[PDB]
Amino acid sequence: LKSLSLIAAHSHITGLGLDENLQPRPTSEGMVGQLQARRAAGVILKMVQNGTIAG
Amino acid sequence: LLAYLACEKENWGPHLIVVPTSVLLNWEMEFKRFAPGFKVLTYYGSPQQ
Amino acid sequence: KALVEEIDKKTYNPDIYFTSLDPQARRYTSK
Amino acid sequence: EGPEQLTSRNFVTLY
Amino acid sequence: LLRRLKADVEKQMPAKYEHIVYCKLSKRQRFLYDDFMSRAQTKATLASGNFMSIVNCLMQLRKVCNHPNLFEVRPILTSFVLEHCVASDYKDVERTLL
Amino acid sequence: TRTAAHTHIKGLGLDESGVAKRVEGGFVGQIEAREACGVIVDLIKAKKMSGRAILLAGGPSTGKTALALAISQELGPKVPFCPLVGSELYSVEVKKTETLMENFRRAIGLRIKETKEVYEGEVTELTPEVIVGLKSAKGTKTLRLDPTIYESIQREKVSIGDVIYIEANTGAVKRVGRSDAYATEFDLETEEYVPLPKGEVHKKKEIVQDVTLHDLDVANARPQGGQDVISMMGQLLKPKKTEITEKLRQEVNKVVAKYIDQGVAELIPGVLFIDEVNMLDIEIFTYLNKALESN
Amino acid sequence: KLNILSLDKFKEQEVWKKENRLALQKRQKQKFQPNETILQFLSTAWLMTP
Amino acid sequence: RKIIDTFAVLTPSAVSLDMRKLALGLNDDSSVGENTRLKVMQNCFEVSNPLHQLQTKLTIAFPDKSLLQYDCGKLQKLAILLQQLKDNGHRALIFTQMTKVLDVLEQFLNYHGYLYMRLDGATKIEDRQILTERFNTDSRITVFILSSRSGGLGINLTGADTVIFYDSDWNPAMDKQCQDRCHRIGQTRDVHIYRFVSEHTIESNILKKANQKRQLDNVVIQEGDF
Amino acid sequence: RTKSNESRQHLRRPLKRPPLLEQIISGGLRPKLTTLEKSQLDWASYVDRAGLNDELVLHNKDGFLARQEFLQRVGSAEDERYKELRRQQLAQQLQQDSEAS
Amino acid sequence: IEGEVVEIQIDRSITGGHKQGKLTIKTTDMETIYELGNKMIDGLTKEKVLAGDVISIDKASGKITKLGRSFAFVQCPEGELQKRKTVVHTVSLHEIDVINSRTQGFLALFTGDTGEIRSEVR
Amino acid sequence: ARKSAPSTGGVKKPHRYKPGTVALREIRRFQKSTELLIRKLPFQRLVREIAQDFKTDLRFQSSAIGALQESVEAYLVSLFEDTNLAAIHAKRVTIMPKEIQLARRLRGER
Ligand SMILES: Nc1ncnc2c1ncn2[C@@H]1O[C@H](COP(=O)(O)OP(=O)(O)O)[C@@H](O)[C@H]1O
Ligand SMILES: [Mg+2]
Which residue from H158, H166, H165, H164 is spatially nearest to H182, judged by alpha carbons?
H158
Cα B26 to Cα G2: distance, rounded to the nearest angstrom: 19
The set of residues, in sequence order, having a beta carbon less than 8 Å from that of A53 and lying 6+ positions away, is: A47, F2, F3, F4
Angle between helices K62-73 and K40-49 (to 10 degrees): 100
Cα–chain-centroid distance for residue K94? Answer: 16
Specify which residues J11 forms β-bridges with.
Answer: G42, J20
Chains touching J by CB (3 or more pairs below 8 Å): D, F, G, H
C-beta of residue F149 within 8 angstroms of C-beta of residue F162: no
Cα H45 to Cα F230: distance, rounded to the nearest angstrom: 9
Q: In 10 A of CB A26, how many CB atoms?
A: 9
For the CA atoms of J41, J46, J51, J52, what is the dihedral angle to 10 degrees?
Answer: -140
Cα K46 to Cα K68: distance, rounded to the nearest angstrom: 12
Burial label, D7 (beta-carbon count in 10 A; 0-12, 13-18, 19+): middle
SS3 D13: strand
Cα E40 to Cα I6: distance, rounded to the nearest angstrom: 22
Task: Give, for B31, the enclosing helix (H) or strand (E).
Answer: helix B24-33
Give residue limits of the domains in chain J. 1-87
Reported as half-sphere exposure (CB side, CA atoms, 13 A), residue I61 has a value of: 13
Angle between helices G2-27 and B24-33 (to 10 degrees): 120
Cα–chain-centroid distance for residue J13? Answer: 25
C-beta of residue H97 within 8 angstroms of C-beta of residue E64: no
Cα G47 to Cα F10: distance, rounded to the nearest angstrom: 75
Phi, psi of F276 (to 5 degrees): 55, 60
Phi, psi of J5 (to 5 degrees): -65, 135
Specify which residues F129 forms β-bridges with.
Answer: none
* Spacing, Cα F68 to ligand 2 middle (Å): 9
The set of residues, in sequence order, having a beta carbon less than 8 Å from that of E61 and lying 6+ positions away, is: H98, H167, H169, H202, H203
Q: State which of F61, F72, F273, F278 you would mutate to test the pocket of ligand 1, scoring each by most atoms of that ligand within 8 A of its C-beta.
A: F61
Pairing of strands J2-13, J53-57: antiparallel
Report the length, in residues, of chain D: 15
Cα–chain-centroid distance for residue E42? Answer: 20
Cα H52 to Cα F232: distance, rounded to the nearest angstrom: 9
Going by CATH, does the domain composed of J1-87 fall within 2.40.50.360?
Answer: yes
Q: In 10 A of CB I8, how many CB atoms?
A: 14
Task: Give, for H219, the enclosing helix (H) or strand (E).
Answer: helix H214-220
DSSP per-residue letters across chain I: ----TT-----S---SSS--HHHHHHHT--TT--HHHHHHHHHHHHHHHH-TTHHHHHHGGGSHHHHHHHHHHHHHHHHHHHHHHHHHHHHHHHHHHHH--
Task: Give, for B27, the enclosing helix (H) or strand (E).
Answer: helix B24-33
Query: Which amino acid belongs to residue E45?
Result: T
Alpha-carbon distances, residue K11 vs K7, K14, K22 (angstroms) = 11, 9, 22
* Spacing, Cα I14 to ligand 1 middle (Å): 27
Which residue from H8, F167, F207, F177 is spatially nearest to E74, judged by alpha carbons?
F207
Which residue from A29, A25, A1, A3 is spatially nearest to A14, judged by alpha carbons?
A29
Alpha-carbon distances, residue K88 vs B19, F187, K20 (angstroms) = 56, 72, 15
H80-84 long-range contacts (CB < 8 A, ≥24 apart) are H81/E21, H81/H164, H81/H194, H82/H112, H82/H114, H82/H142, H82/H143
Report the length, in residues, of chain G: 50
* Spacing, Cα F63 to ligand 2 middle (Å): 6
Specify which residues D11 forms β-bridges with.
Answer: G42
B15-20 long-range contacts (CB < 8 A, ≥24 apart) are B20/H153
Nearest CA in chain H to F211: H13
SS3 B24: helix
Pairing of strands F131-135, F140-144: antiparallel
Cα D6 to Cα J52: distance, rounded to the nearest angstrom: 7
Cα F161 to Cα F158: distance, rounded to the nearest angstrom: 9
Contact present, E and J (at least 3 Cβ pairs less than 8 Å): no
- Find the DSSP H helices in chain G: 2-27
The verdict on G11 touching H (C-beta cutoff 8 Å) is no
Nearest ligand to the C-alpha atom of residue F24: 1
C-beta of residue I65 within 8 angstroms of C-beta of residue I46: no
C-beta of residue H117 within 8 angstroms of C-beta of residue H135: yes
Q: Is F86 annotated to bind ligand? A: no
Cα H55 to Cα F268: distance, rounded to the nearest angstrom: 32
Angle between helices G2-27 and H126-136 (to 10 degrees): 70
Buried b (16+ CB within 10 A) or exposed e, I52-79: eeeebebbbebbbeeeeeeeeebeeeee
Pairing of strands H162-165, H191-196: parallel
Alpha-carbon distances, residue H210 vs E51, E61, H173, I29 (angstroms) = 25, 15, 10, 17
SS3 H38: helix
SS3 J114: coil
Q: Is F99 annotated to bind ligand? A: no
The set of residues, in sequence order, having a beta carbon less than 8 Å from that of A36 and lying 6+ positions away, is: A24
The beta strand positions in chain J, using DSSP E, are 2-13, 19-26, 31-36, 53-57, 64-69
Specify which residues G42 forms β-bridges with.
Answer: D11, J11
Cα angle, residue H193 at apex, residues H189 and H196 outer, rounded to 5°: 150
For the CA atoms of I75, I80, I82, I88, what is the dihedral angle to 10 degrees?
Answer: -170
Taking phi over 0 as left and psi of -120 to 50 as alpha, with beta for the rest, I97 belongs to: alpha
Query: Which amino acid belongs to residue H82?
Result: L
* Spacing, Cα B27 to ligand 2 middle (Å): 81
C-alpha R_g of chain I: 28
Cα–chain-centroid distance for residue I14? Answer: 22
Nearest ligand to the C-alpha atom of residue F63: 1
Burial label, I89 (beta-carbon count in 10 A; 0-12, 13-18, 19+): exposed
Which residue from B7, B9, B27, B5 is spatially nearest to B17, judged by alpha carbons?
B27
Task: Give, for H93, the enclosing helix (H) or strand (E).
Answer: strand H92-96
Cα J50 to Cα H77: distance, rounded to the nearest angstrom: 48
Which residue from I67, D7, A7, K67 is spatially nearest to E68, judged by alpha carbons?
I67
The set of residues, in sequence order, having a beta carbon less than 8 Å from that of F178 and lying 6+ positions away, is: F159, F161, F162, F163, F191, F193, F194
C-beta of residue H153 within 8 angstroms of C-beta of residue B20: yes
Which residue from I82, F54, H190, F260 is spatially nearest to K53, judged by alpha carbons?
I82
Cα C25 to Cα C20: distance, rounded to the nearest angstrom: 9
C-beta of residue K87 within 8 angstroms of C-beta of residue K93: yes
Task: Give, for H126, the enclosing helix (H) or strand (E).
Answer: helix H126-136
Q: In 10 A of CB K69, how many CB atoms?
A: 16
Residue F5 beta carbon below 6 angstroms from any ligand 1 atom: yes
Interface test with F, best of A47, A49, A53 (most F CBs within 10 A): A53
Resolution in A: 3.8
Nearest CA in chain J to D4: J72
Q: Is F7 annotated to bind ligand? A: no
C-beta of residue F107 within 8 angstroms of C-beta of residue F52: no
Phi, psi of H88 (to 5 degrees): -65, -45
The set of residues, in sequence order, having a beta carbon less than 8 Å from that of F33 and lying 6+ positions away, is: F56, F67
SS3 J7: strand
Specify which residues H191 forms β-bridges with.
Answer: E16
C-beta of residue I35 within 8 angstroms of C-beta of residue H209: yes
Q: Is F77 annotated to bind ligand? A: no
C-beta of residue A38 within 8 angstroms of C-beta of residue A15: no
Alpha-carbon distances, residue K51 vs F179, F200, H208, J25, K63 (angstroms) = 52, 36, 51, 80, 16
Contacts of K4 in chain H (CB under 8 A): 126, 130
Pairing of strands F140-144, C5-7: antiparallel
3-state secondary structure chain F: CCECCCCCCCCCCECCCCCECCEECCEECCHHHHHHHHHHHHHHHHCCCCCCCCCCCCCCCCCHHHHHHHHHHHHCCCCCEEEEEHHHHCCCCCCHHHHHHHHHHCCCEEEECEEEEEEEEEEEEEECCCEEEEECCCCEEEEECCHHHHHHHHHCCCCCCEEEEEECCCCEEEEEEEEHHHCCCCCCCCCCEECCCCCCCEEEEEECCEEEHHHHHHHHHCCCCCCCHHHHHHHCCCCCCCCCCHHHHHHHHHHHHHHHHHCCEEEECCEEEEECHHHCCHHHHHHHHHHHCCC
The beta strand positions in B1-49, using DSSP E, are none
SS3 K94: coil
Nearest CA to ligand 1 atom 13: F63
Q: In 10 A of CB J114, how many CB atoms?
A: 16
Cα of K11 to nearest chain G Cα, Å: 18
Cα H71 to Cα K86: distance, rounded to the nearest angstrom: 70
Cα K34 to Cα H9: distance, rounded to the nearest angstrom: 70
In the 8-state DSSP scheme, what is residue C28? S
Residue F64 beta carbon below 6 angstroms from any ligand 1 atom: yes
- Find the DSSP H helices in K12-96: 21-31, 40-49, 62-73, 76-89
Cα G43 to Cα D9: distance, rounded to the nearest angstrom: 5
Specify which residues I24 forms β-bridges with.
Answer: none
Q: Which method, experimentally, gave rise to this model?
A: cryo-EM
Specify which residues F28 forms β-bridges with.
Answer: F23
Cα F215 to Cα H11: distance, rounded to the nearest angstrom: 12
Contacts of A47 in chain F (CB under 8 A): none
Burial label, A44 (beta-carbon count in 10 A; 0-12, 13-18, 19+): exposed
Interface test with I, best of F208, F258, F260, F261 (most I CBs within 10 A): F208
